[PDB]
Design a protein around this ligand. Structure first.
Ligand SMILES: CCCCCC/C=C\CCCCCCCCCC(=O)O[C@H](COC(=O)CCCCCCCCCCCCCCC)COP(=O)(O)OC[C@@H](O)CO
Ligand SMILES: CCCCCC/C=C\CCCCCCCCCC(=O)O[C@H](COC(=O)CCCCCCCCCCCCCCC)COP(=O)(O)OC[C@@H](O)CO
Ligand SMILES: CCCCCCCCCCCCCCCCCC(=O)O[C@@H](COC(=O)CCCCCCCCCCCCCCC)COP(=O)(O)OCCN
Ligand SMILES: CCCCCCCCCCCCCCCCCC(=O)O[C@@H](COC(=O)CCCCCCCCCCCCCCC)COP(=O)(O)OCCN
Ligand code: HEM
Ligand code: HEM
Ligand code: HEM
Ligand code: HEM
Ligand SMILES: CCCCCCCCCCCCO[C@@H]1O[C@H](CO)[C@@H](O[C@H]2O[C@H](CO)[C@@H](O)[C@H](O)[C@H]2O)[C@H](O)[C@H]1O
Ligand SMILES: CCCCCCCCCCCCO[C@@H]1O[C@H](CO)[C@@H](O[C@H]2O[C@H](CO)[C@@H](O)[C@H](O)[C@H]2O)[C@H](O)[C@H]1O
Ligand code: SF4
Ligand code: SF4
Ligand code: F3S
Ligand code: F3S
Ligand code: FES
Lengths: 520, 257, 239, 239, 127
């Protein structure tokens, strides 16, 4: 964490040099803003697309290196397995997504920068293709999964209009600083939300939780929202949503200044839902957003497999049980620019270059396994689609391993996950062929990995008999609803080893000692 | 809503394509266009037909993956949005919607609606960057960028690389994409040391990749999701004229890998 | 490394060449319409204008020297214009041949929101090229479109340009050809006067509307004058 | 967001407008004095100059076309000049009105160190405006200051400008009005030739004295010529 | 418009000794208003032009100079000052001998800002 905070300054220098159009003041110098809950203005931003401009700078540097010939770029290529030779990550097995060709690549070191597994819950703020295939294959090859159950949610997300939808668009939580969360008191109401009288509105988070008034943390408020929607009282096309109303703030403050504060958000909400939030209440619903778990890495950003380096969201690393705002972009750019160049050189200087080709038996075994898996997926020809199984898995994981977790629910999920996996492998429909642009095949592979990863996530959540950050156990909480830690028994990182049994992975504790920031 | 869909179906690059008709009995007005395509794909899979393949990652209008020519317009009838940001409330009951890929020589079709847009990557590789290595950057406040120049460069830099400018251009030209990158890097001081080279290289690459020329028509700006203006193209033109006055010669083109 | 001649290397540079040669050609077309407006002034004024075109700056410049310099500039400008137009049209056709429904359809539907300037510019350019060839052969040389004994070539310093104009627009087919060319030249000017400013980079948000208005004014003036000429000659107003 | 037309928004922009229109008007005044110097050559040369002002570029431009373009430019320049001068005079009057000894006196004492350019410039501008009106009615139109049977209007290409001038400066009152206007126009030029350069920013320490000398030269030349004309006509030197 | 804490190293941007000397010549304005009192038009042109020249001769004043002059000129109009007839009685009485080259510099800045279509902001209303 100190290393990340210490290299953040170099990150900002590099991004400004690369041409990232950060916000400037009128005098020409950089402009800072503050997130929600932060006491300093330490955030550098493009107007509303900071991540786009950061990735555009990084992608322009990558394009410069592609032109220089030092980097070979393989887009539309999905890594389907990790090849470990003599205990080292010596290659990968990939499938071209257009021609369907399986290719073997050999390297002296393998870096996994494959993002988070937040899509193990079907409904999430992540992109449609975001998956856990790379880190799960590395985990099955010998990498330890560090705190898989550590998942972050976003409070303010645009809900779904039906069972078809799988993506919840993220809305700046700041929409929670100026709105009131409510639900009609009648379980089934046909009236328009603006026509509902004040006395007939259930303003939960205000009637309950008098403390943290209008400033409830995202976890408590989102658990309350999920409970309300599960009780049948939520609003929206499927009942999964709550009314974040802005009527009283519009009446109180100036509509012009409210526009200056949330114009892009309101226009986007009206584009997505078709309802103007200046008159009608906005509808929101919590969604899984980030996964600060991932493959355990050491100070050198190296996993349990020597030569395998995991960076970005794919590793556990240094977000703890809750990732701060504007810290995942910081961590990714830090790992890429100012940490991995050193630690990977440290690893490579102690080994000889080359010596492993793609003709090794390990490459052939991994390729045969991948081919057999793809053929089996294409040959099942069941009566259920891939997204049906993914939706069932995500529903179970969001109900059982989501913002509210308990022992009985996690045990039920641990019973059901293998059943869903067996039903998938016996009754999934993957049309098409292997050597074609088969998007159903890619989805099938990702969901096949998700079905195994979810069991580990639930086992880790049942393991941790405490609440910390995003991981919330209902049996370990303060009377206010906040997370209650057990630093005497759970002050460690749980790195899980794949033992060949999906239900019985091996737990390896990495003790945590705090010499500079004492727990409190 | 009852929606009739005339969707381009092509097996691969070599196979000739055609229009196939699909009737959606029930379409939710709140349902997005890509969500409706997903429902159609699920129906096709249940029936045993080949699902329609289209590019999509973010479904937020920022990644640039979605690329559909809907009813003759890139990204659908509604402007300043993407295909993913287009929802079925923009259509009516009984409507017929024609769904197409991008049509351009430099944007080959790989599947029903999927298009190979790597020519944009090779345009970027031909100078669409600032040649600064990691570790050599000075303090982030060493060089002042005026708020106006920063805002204009952020206006140009907000380009999701969808290729809809190429698709809507009558000439199939990548002028808006190239001009947006040229304007983004030319409005900042950090892009001054290599700007007159960059535009030339980039323009030459757009010629090498197979894109057309600019007749100053403006359909590219009409369909741009990010409302990138034709002022970017005027800026690129100014840069290219200035580079010609300086005798700047394009480098070797970025050949594909 | 070859200087300004690097413009030929890029399509944008060829378009800049088109913008400069179109500046020259637009100026000539406006000046030509203004000069030919002297038909309504009368035969004596029109013939004096025709003769004084050749005798431009006589006490300093020789006979037809300025006119021959102007002719060479026009020829070079129009040749560069046509060459660059051919190259750019071929490039834009190759840019659409590979991925299109046919050789005549790119999309099953392509609704246009910003004009059909490509179609009008290219077809009007080919028409204007043909018209320039035929019109030079018609009025400058009188080797086509004339009954025998109707066209009077210049005899020293005595010019019968008014007589040639009067006897030229008698066949309704020639009048129709001229009117069609003037329609397509009006479309050419209407797009190209704005587009040549946009091509050189001399455009922005605040002056875009002004340049569109200038394009409309130039196109309308040239169209009105250049269609008034043969219509008035054919209808007997000019005789 | 408006463009160059944002100059109307500021007083400094209005002064820049007045500097440009003063460039135009100073050029016209110098050229006009130079042309009117031809009256000493004789009636033939002066009338030829008057006629050739209309036939400027006859083999190319029609009669009075260049003259009418020059007239329109002069009218637009003088209108913008007068509008900006009125706006700025009103602004400075408002700037002085609130805190002053009276409506006329600003300070119980104001010893001036850098001349009286405001007084002379404003009073001379009003005088020059009145003189332009009376002068257009006098010599251009001959509807004032003439006995019945002395002004000859140009019907064809034959001009009697020399006769009109000779018959014009016969009344001593008209000669005195012209002389007073020339004095105030000399003061106007003496300040404004330097001031238009200072208003556009084309001034510094090194060229300030050179621009003051240029202003003195322009003012002296125009004053000497423009007072020589009516005095010589009145005294019989020009007849 | 530079905030506290964001300034770079003081030797980052070189200012030539001539430009620094000219900007110090303009910056030496004590805001007495004697230019307004000596001006026959009651104009604040010498004071405004001194500030415009001081900030426009340094690199740090480049990012917002063409806006600034326009705004400042507009404010001087809004406050009730007169126009500049280039009389020069402002510079005769100036305690700090602020030259008329400052007004020429302001004029160049305003012409350049007009060419760029710089619109003055809303005026500073009194408190
Ligand atoms: C004609 C010559 C005048 C133009 C000379 C070039 C000026 C220029 O810059 O070109 C454009 C000309 O504007 C314009 O419509 C000016 C063109 C003329 C408009 C009026 C028609 C007569 C304006 O571009 P800007 O957005 O201000 O450029 C921003 C800078 O970063 C570019 O370096
Ligand atoms: C027509 C005259 C064109 C003059 C040239 C354009 C203006 C110019 O070149 O500027 C002025 C030149 O005018 C001058 O004295 C020279 C003009 C009059 C010379 C006679 C004075 O500028 P400087 O004091 O050097 O200021 C330099 C910079 O700070 C300006 O940004
Ligand atoms: C600021 C000043 C503006 C210009 C004012 C002065 C301009 C000069 C006017 C001179 C008029 C009297 C001389 C007449 C003349 O032309 O005579 C000789 C003049 O030659 C000279 O020696 C003088 C040449 C220099 C004057 C030319 C300068 C022109 C300036 C134009 C400024 C305004 C532009 C509009 C040439 O010989 P000729 O064959 O004409 O003999 C007389 C007739 N038989
Ligand atoms: C730009 C579009 C092309 C120009 C269109 C205007 C040119 C023709 C205007 C009508 C001309 C009618 C004949 C001349 C005439 O009567 O013009 C009078 C006034 O006309 C104007 O004011 C016309 C001004 C035209 C400006 C020149 C435009 C140049 C275009 C580019 C070259 C002068 O009266 P006059 O008796 O002395 O003329 C001789 C009559 N037999
Ligand atoms: C009467 C003489 C002509 C005039 C005044 C004229 C005027 C113009 C102008 C001003 C432009 C705009 C240039 C730019 O966009 O930068 C233009 C474009 C064009 N002109 Fe011409 N033109 C003339 C003759 C021709 C001829 C003979 C052709 C024959 C092909 C032609 C074909 C074109 C084409 C194709 C374009 C647009 C190029 C493109 O598609 O990118 N023109 N013209
Ligand atoms: C109906 C309208 C027009 C009339 C009445 C007209 C009339 C004439 C006449 C009588 C000539 C012979 C004089 C000579 O060759 O010197 C001529 C020449 C010419 N015209 Fe036109 N013209 C018209 C339209 C155009 C247009 C639209 C163009 C556009 C390029 C054009 C270009 C020329 C050229 C290049 C010449 C040859 C000039 C020369 O040889 O010196 N004309 N025109
Ligand atoms: C031949 C006619 C005229 C010429 C050549 C002429 C020339 C000039 C010039 C060159 C300036 C300096 C502009 C500047 O300082 O930037 C000026 C200033 C001025 N002129 Fe004129 N002018 C003429 C007629 C008039 C008329 C008709 C009026 C009023 C009706 C007028 C009123 C003024 C005023 C008030 C100023 C100075 C205002 C100020 O500096 O604040 N002038 N003149
Ligand atoms: C005593 C000196 C002057 C003499 C002898 C003189 C002579 C003449 C004559 C004879 C005319 C009629 C010719 C014509 O209208 O084309 C005329 C017109 C004119 N004069 Fe003067 N003038 C004198 C001073 C001035 C001054 C100081 C101005 C300053 C603005 C001026 C502006 C004009 C204008 C605008 C016309 C009309 C031009 C036209 O209609 O084409 N004159 N002058
Ligand atoms: C009336 C006489 C004039 C008109 C008749 C002659 C027309 C000639 C043009 C026909 C096409 C050949 O035109 C030729 O196009 C090619 C590629 O298209 C251009 O080729 C050049 O630019 C293109 C991109 O712009 C790239 O391939 C490359 O940089 C270079 O080869 C040539 O610069 C041009 O000469
Ligand atoms: C005959 C030819 C025209 C004769 C004169 C007619 C015009 C008289 C002008 C007098 C009124 O002046 C008119 O109003 C004000 C001046 O207060 C100017 O308007 C401007 O004034 C000053 C700047 O100079 C600003 O403070 C003000 O906000 C702005 O509106 C107008 O641009 C001008 O046109
Ligand atoms: S310029 Fe606009 S339309 Fe073209 S690729 Fe970029 S975002 Fe898409
Ligand atoms: S007189 Fe000089 S010091 Fe005083 S306010 Fe005016 S410019 Fe400043
Ligand atoms: S529509 Fe095409 S011609 Fe140029 S201005 Fe846009 S790329
Ligand atoms: S005296 Fe007054 S007119 Fe201007 S130059 Fe000085 S403020
Ligand atoms: S899917 Fe990313 S822009 Fe539409």
């Amino acid at each position: 964490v100190y290393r990340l905070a210490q290299v953040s300054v170099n990150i900002i220098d590099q991004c400004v040099a690369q041409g990232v159009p950060f916000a400037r003041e009128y005098g020409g110098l950089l402009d800072n803003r503050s997130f929600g809950g932060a006491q300093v203005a330490r955030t550098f931003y493009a107007r509303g697309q900071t991540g786009q401009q950061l990735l555009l700078g990084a992608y322009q540097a990558l394009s410069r290196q592609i032109a220089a010939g030092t980097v070979k770029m393989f887009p539309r290529t999905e890594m389907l397995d990790l090849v470990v030779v003599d205990g080292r990550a010596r290659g990968i097995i990939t499938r071209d997504m257009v021609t369907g060709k399986i290719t073997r690549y050999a390297a002296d070191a393998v870096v996994l920068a494959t993002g988070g597994y937040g899509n193990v819950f079907y409904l999430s703020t992540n992109a449609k293709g975001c998956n856990a295939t790379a880190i799960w294959r590395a985990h099955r090859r010998g990498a330890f999964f560090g705190n898989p159950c550590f998942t972050q949610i976003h409070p303010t997300c645009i809900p779904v209009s039906g069972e078809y939808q799988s993506k919840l668009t993220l809305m700046s939580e700041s929409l929670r600083n100026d709105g009131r969360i409510w639900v009609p008191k009648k379980k089934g109401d046909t009236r328009r939300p603006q026509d509902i009288p004040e006395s007939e509105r259930d303003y939960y988070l205000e009637e309950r939780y008098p403390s943290f008034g209008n400033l409830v943390p995202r976890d408590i408020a989102s658990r309350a929202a999920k409970q309300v929607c599960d009780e049948g009282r939520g609003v929206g096309p499927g009942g999964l949503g709550v009314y974040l109303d802005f009527a009283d703030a519009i009446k109180r403050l100036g509509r012009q200044k409210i526009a200056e504060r949330y114009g892009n958000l309101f226009d986007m909400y009206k584009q997505i839902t078709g309802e103007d939030p200046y008159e009608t209440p906005m509808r929101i619903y919590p969604a899984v957003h980030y996964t600060m778990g991932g493959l355990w890495v050491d100070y050198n950003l190296q996993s349990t497999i020597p030569g395998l380096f995991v960076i970005g969201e794919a590793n556990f690393s240094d977000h703890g049980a809750n990732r701060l705002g504007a810290s995942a972009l910081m961590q990714g750019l830090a790992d890429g620019y100012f940490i991995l160049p050193y630690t990977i050189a440290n690893f490579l200087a102690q080994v000889k270059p080359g010596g492993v080709s793609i003709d090794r038996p390990e490459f052939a075994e991994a390729e045969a396994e991948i081919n057999q898996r793809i053929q089996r997926l294409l040959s099942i020809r069941g009566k259920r689609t891939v997204d049906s199984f993914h939706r069932e898995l995500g529903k179970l994981m969001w109900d059982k391993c989501g913002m509210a977790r308990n022992a009985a629910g996690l045990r039920e999920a641990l019973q059901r996950i293998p059943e869903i996996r067996a039903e998938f492998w016996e009754n999934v429909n993957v049309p098409g062929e292997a050597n074609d642009l088969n998007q159903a095949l890619e989805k099938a592979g990702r969901v096949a990995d998700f079905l195994e990863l979810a069991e580990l996530m639930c086992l880790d959540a049942l393991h941790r008999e405490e609440s910390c950050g995003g991981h919330f156990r209902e049996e370990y909480q303060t009377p206010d609803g906040e997370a209650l830690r057990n630093d005497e028994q759970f002050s460690y990182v749980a790195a899980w080893e794949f033992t060949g049994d999906l239900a019985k992975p091996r737990l390896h504790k990495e003790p945590l000692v705090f010499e500079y920031v004492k727990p409190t | 809503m009852k929606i009739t869909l005339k969707i381009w179906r092509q097996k691969n690059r070599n196979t000739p394509g055609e229009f196939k008709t699909y009737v959606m009995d029930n379409v939710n007005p709140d349902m997005s266009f890509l969500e409706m395509l997903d429902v159609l794909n699920e129906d096709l899979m249940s029936r045993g037909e080949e699902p329609v393949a289209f590019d999509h990652d973010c479904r937020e209008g920022i990644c640039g993956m979605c690329s559909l020519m809907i009813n003759g317009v890139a990204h659908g009838p509604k402007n300043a949005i993407t295909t993913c940001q287009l929802h079925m409330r923009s259509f009516k009951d009984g409507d017929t919607i024609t769904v197409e890929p991008w049509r351009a020589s430099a944007f080959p079709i790989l599947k029903d609606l999927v298009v190979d847009r790597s020519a944009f990557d090779r345009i970027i590789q031909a100078g669409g960057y600032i040649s600064v290595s990691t570790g050599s950057a000075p303090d982030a406040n060493t060089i002042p960028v005026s708020k106006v120049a920063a805002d204009r460069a952020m206006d140009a830099a907000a380009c999701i690389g969808c290729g809809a400018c190429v698709a809507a251009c009558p000439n199939g030209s990548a002028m808006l994409f190239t001009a947006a990158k040229v304007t983004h890097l030319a409005l900042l001081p950090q892009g001054q040391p290599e700007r007159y080279q960059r535009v030339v290289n980039m323009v030459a690459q757009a010629d090498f990749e197979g894109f057309g020329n600019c007749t100053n028509i403006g359909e590219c700006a009409a369909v741009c999701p990010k409302e990138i203006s034709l002022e970017t193209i005027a800026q690129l033109n100014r840069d290219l004229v200035m580079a010609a006055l300086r005798g700047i010669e394009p480098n070797t083109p970025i050949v594909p890998a | 490394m070859t200087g300004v001649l690097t413009l030929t290397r890029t399509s944008v540079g060829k378009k800049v060449i088109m913008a400069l040669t179109g500046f020259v050609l637009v100026g000539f077309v406006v000046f030509h319409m203004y000069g030919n407006l002297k038909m309504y002034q009368g035969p004596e004024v029109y013939n004096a204008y025709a003769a004084g075109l050749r005798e431009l700056g006589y006490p300093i410049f020789g006979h037809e020297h300025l006119l021959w310099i102007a002719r060479f500039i026009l020829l070079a400008s129009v040749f560069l214009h046509i060459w660059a137009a051919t190259s750019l049209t071929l490039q834009s056709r190759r840019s659409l041949q590979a991925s299109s429904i046919s050789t005549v359809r790119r999309y099953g539907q392509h609704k246009r929101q910003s004009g059909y300037a490509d179609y009008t510019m290219r077809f009007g350019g080919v028409l204007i090229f043909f018209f320039i060839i035929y019109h030079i052969l018609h009025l400058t040389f009188g080797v086509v479109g004339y009954e025998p004994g109707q066209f009077i070539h210049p005899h020293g310093d005595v010019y019968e340009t008014y007589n040639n104009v009067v006897y030229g627009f008698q066949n309704p087919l020639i009048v129709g050809f001229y009117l069609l060319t003037m329609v397509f030249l009006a479309l050419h000017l209407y797009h190209g006067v704005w587009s040549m400013f946009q091509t050189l980079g001399w455009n922005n948000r605040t002056y875009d509307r002004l340049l569109r208005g200038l394009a409309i004014v130039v196109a309308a003036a040239v169209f009105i004058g250049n269609i008034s000429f043969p219509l008035a000659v054919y209808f007997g107003f000019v005789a």
